[PDB]
Design a protein around this nucleic acid. Structure first.
Lengths: 65, 70, 82, 81, 75, 78, 81, 113, 135, 69
RNA sequence: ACAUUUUUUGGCACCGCGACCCUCGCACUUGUGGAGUCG
């Protein structure tokens, strides 16, 4: 599943935990953003094995079948 | 007579659009709660009135919401 | 139910932590509060393209911590048990 | 406490106090306002009394920021003391 | 004293020209008629109109504007 | 610095403190809170303009936890 | 209950300084404080974030938007702690 | 050692010189163990060399470094003592991994089971 | 009376009139202060050389009055009443520094002492409690 | 829990300094424990009044500095 | 012991420096002379 986030981070990851606050424990984690000081165009993404996440960050979660 | 929560309840299984803290959305409402978090189907991402992408099945977090509309 | 409990259970872990202002923080979690206030030891602050700054002890607040990057080896299901 | 007057009042308050501290640290472990009334003056308080006396005798008329300072024992005891 | 809740209720009873300001957003305002009331500042406001502020007029339908991003009311 | 468990156990230690605005408050923690508000004994706000450390001595300061980011130990007691 | 809150309450009467989220420092006699740091102050100066200062009478401030409060150093002594 | 601790807080060849200078002796052996653990290549073997500049556990670290140099480490083990179980551990490492290396340890062991 | 870790740990620590530590023949073992001080007072000691410091990012003020400083290995440096004798011995200060005091040092009476310091340590703004002026 | 003691400021004109470097004026008519303000209307700071009476949300208030003493 | 306005479910992200001259005053400090030029 993919998650949109306040800081422009598309978090494509496998969900493990879930709560009232929409905090999440994540496996198989693959974030997507862009380190870019203007004018520039770069698309970057990194793999992380295991990752805890805070809920205020979360804007919209989505499920791609 | 019409409060907000009941309106929200009524509007389940119907088209809605959401603005954020900004980007517009467009999709059919699945269900809602007291905290005003959302779950939608056939989500289309109106980037300032421009449908950038059609995501489909989504869940919007409450605090980023601005307003609901048909 | 609670992720707080899970967090508490995670003790003495050498972990990276990511903030709302993007600061990468390499340290050993000695403890965490019920409200996610992280207490680290053997701490290393780096920014996301500039030089590093190391510190012995840091108590970071719960509201700031965006993502705690967990350790390499971890049994999650077990942790999740009450 | 020693009372200093005849000080160049053009120095900013925080710089005056920091140079005063530096200069007087040589005699022992160590109040200045810019109001009309108090400008050009300062009270320097030392832990030891012998330090105050030594400071007074050795820095009488010392050129500080261009003017010769005039030092004297304060009239009253400092609140901190 | 006139509490805020009471005022809101009065407004609802009336059905009058309400002009809402947005929290941390200068350029936009809302203009409509109050229909709903909540324990928090949240309300539903049918026949709403989005307004760009004078540093014209824009089309908008029926809306509930969320309580957290409200600022001003008048009715 | 010592290897503490909590903040409460390290009361009266000289503390570096960061806040969301980017200022750095330094001073001895006199008292803590349920919401991480800090009383600081001899507080100095140290700020950095967009170059080199600007410095301001405050005194006895109540510091709100909302704005607090993180606290670090500057030195031992006394 | 919060000891900082208590301290703030105690500081009532005294001349507290007070910066907000905006970065607009005030100084004044603390009239009233509450559990939520909802401060009132008298005879209060008001510095702009850029530099310029403005005198004003009886300011109210909501603790949410308050950043940090400076209290006088006499309260350090006693007898809350 | 406290200066070594503050220097450790401050913390490659010159740094290694500062660390080796920083290294009572048991704390230094613990530091060499910290180096052998943190390095877990050839630089670790260099740390073993500095440790030599500073024993069966050191031989175990030499086994972790794993062939004539290992035999030299066996010579260091012989230097460590004239003879009791640790020497048997040395013969055990000699047997587990140069048939002469095992036969010699078997000979010293010979010096019904 | 070596400057030791133990010595530093029992030393008066306070907020001065900045965080200052109240303090010997040789400057050493400063690691133990843990970089927690804005000022360090080394007045009235027997130090010969201003050297031996660990990396100390906090340290902005050094009061070194009445010692025996004859050689130099930071915003304010007070060296009053020490033993610096040659203008060239002050050269290492060019690599630092806004407030400098070298009074009561033999070097003071050397011809052109003030101009030499000004040209070789231009970052100094106040020298011996007198404003470095343009002229 | 406790009520904001604004009974001193009741029925007086106040500069409500509000979120986003904005302002409001007007005579104070009421308030609550969340510090929402009910006030008889005035201008937004050259100047232009909107409304007959106005209600300001609690969160939005930076300050409510008294115009009258 | 628990997320919907005051804290921890975030509204985040992309006076000083040149000149001149005034004041000689025993204190506990938002700040502190004045004219003129530079920022």
């Amino acid at each position: 599943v993919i998650i949109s986030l306040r800081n422009n981070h598309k978090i494509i990851a496998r969900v493990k935990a879930f709560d009232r606050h929409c905090n999440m424990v994540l496996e198989n984690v693959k974030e997507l953003w862009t380190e870019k000081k203007g004018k520039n165009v770069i698309n970057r993404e990194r793999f992380i094995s295991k990752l805890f996440l805070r809920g205020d960050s979360v804007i919209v979660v989505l499920k791609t079948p | 007579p019409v409060n907000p929560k009941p309106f929200l309840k009524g509007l389940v299984n119907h088209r809605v659009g959401v603005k954020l803290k900004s980007t517009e959305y467009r999709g059919t409402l699945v269900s809602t709660d007291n905290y005003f978090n959302l779950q939608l189907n056939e989500a289309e991402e109106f980037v300032a009135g421009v449908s950038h992408g059609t995501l489909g099945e989504i869940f919007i977090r409450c605090n980023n919401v601005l307003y609901i509309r048909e | 139910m609670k992720l707080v409990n899970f967090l508490k259970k995670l003790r003495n872990e050498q972990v990276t932590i990511e903030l709302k202002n993007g600061t990468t923080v390499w340290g050993t979690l000695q403890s965490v509060s019920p409200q996610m206030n992280a207490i680290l030891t053997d701490v290393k602050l780096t920014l996301p393209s500039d030089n590093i700054a190391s510190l012995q002890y840091i108590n970071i607040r719960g509201n700031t911590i965006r993502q705690i990057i967990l350790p390499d080896s971890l049994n999650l299901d077990s942790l999740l048990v009450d | 406490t020693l009372y200093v007057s005849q000080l160049n009042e053009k120095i900013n308050m925080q710089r005056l106090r920091v140079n005063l501290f530096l200069l007087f640290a040589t005699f022992g472990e160590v109040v200045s306002m810019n109001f009309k009334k108090q400008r050009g003056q300062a009270f320097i308080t030392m832990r030891t009394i012998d330090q105050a006396s030594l400071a007074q005798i050795s820095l009488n008329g010392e050129r500080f920021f261009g003017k010769p300072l005039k030092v004297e024992f304060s009239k009253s005891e400092t609140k901190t003391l | 004293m006139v509490p805020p809740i009471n005022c809101i209720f009065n407004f609802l009873q009336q059905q009058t020209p309400v002009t809402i300001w947005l929290f941390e957003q200068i350029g936009i305002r809302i203009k409509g008629k109050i229909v709903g009331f909540d324990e928090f500042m949240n309300v539903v406001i049918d026949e709403a109109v989005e307004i760009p502020v004078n540093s014209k007029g824009t089309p908008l339908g029926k809306i509930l504007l969320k309580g957290d991003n409200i600022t001003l009311i008048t009715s | 610095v010592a290897h503490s468990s909590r903040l409460a156990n390290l009361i009266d230690y000289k503390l570096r403190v960061l806040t969301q605005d980017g200022r750095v408050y330094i001073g001895q923690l006199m008292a803590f809170d349920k919401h991480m508000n800090l009383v600081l004994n001899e507080c100095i706000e140290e700020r950095v303009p967009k170059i080199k450390v600007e410095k301001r001595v405050l005194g006895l300061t109540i510091l709100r936890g909302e704005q607090i980011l993180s606290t670090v130990v500057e030195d031992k007691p006394l | 209950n919060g000891i900082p809150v208590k301290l703030l309450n105690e500081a009532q009467g005294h001349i507290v300084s007070l910066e907000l989220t905006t970065g607009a420092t005030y100084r004044g006699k603390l009239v009233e404080s509450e559990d939520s740091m909802n401060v009132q102050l008298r005879d209060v100066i008001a510095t702009e974030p850029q530099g310029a200062v403005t005198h004003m009478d009886q300011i109210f401030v909501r603790g949410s938007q308050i950043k940090f409060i400076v209290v006088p150093d006499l309260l350090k002594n006693a007898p809350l702690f | 050692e406290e200066k070594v601790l503050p220097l450790t807080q401050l913390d490659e060849e010159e740094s290694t010189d500062e660390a080796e200078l920083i290294n009572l002796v048991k704390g230094f052996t613990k530091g060499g163990f910290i180096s052998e653990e943190i390095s877990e290549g050839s630089r670790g073997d260099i740390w073993s060399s500095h440790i030599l500049e500073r024993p069966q556990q050191k031989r175990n670290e030499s086994l972790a470094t794993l062939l004539t140099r290992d035999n030299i480490t066996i010579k260091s083990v012989y230097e460590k003592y004239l003879p009791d179980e640790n020497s048997g551990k040395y013969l055990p490492s000699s047997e587990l991994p140069e048939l002469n290396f095992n036969y010699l340890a078997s000979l010293e062991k010979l010096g019904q089971y | 009376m070596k400057f030791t870790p133990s010595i530093v740990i029992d030393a008066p620590q306070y907020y001065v009139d900045d965080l200052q530590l109240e303090t010997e023949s040789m400057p050493s073992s400063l690691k133990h202060l843990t970089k927690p001080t804005h000022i360090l007072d080394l007045t009235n000691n027997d130090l010969i050389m201003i050297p031996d410091l660990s990396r100390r990012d906090d340290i902005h003020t050094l009061l070194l009055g009445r010692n025996n400083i004859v050689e130099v290995d930071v915003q304010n440096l007070t060296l009053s009443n020490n033993s610096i004798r040659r203008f060239e011995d002050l050269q290492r200060l060019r690599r630092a520094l806004k407030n400098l005091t070298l009074i009561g040092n033999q070097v003071c009476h050397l011809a052109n002492y003030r101009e030499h310091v000004l040209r070789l340590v231009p970052h100094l703004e106040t020298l011996d409690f007198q404003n470095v002026t343009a002229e | 829990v406790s009520t904001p003691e604004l009974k001193k400021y009741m029925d007086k004109k106040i500069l409500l300094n509000i979120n986003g470097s904005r302002k409001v004026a007007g005579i104070l008519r009421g308030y609550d424990i969340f510090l929402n303000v009910v006030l008889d209307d005035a201008m937004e700071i050259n100047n232009h009044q909107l409304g007959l009476q106005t209600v300001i949300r609690g969160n939005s208030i930076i300050s409510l500095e008294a115009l009258d003493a």
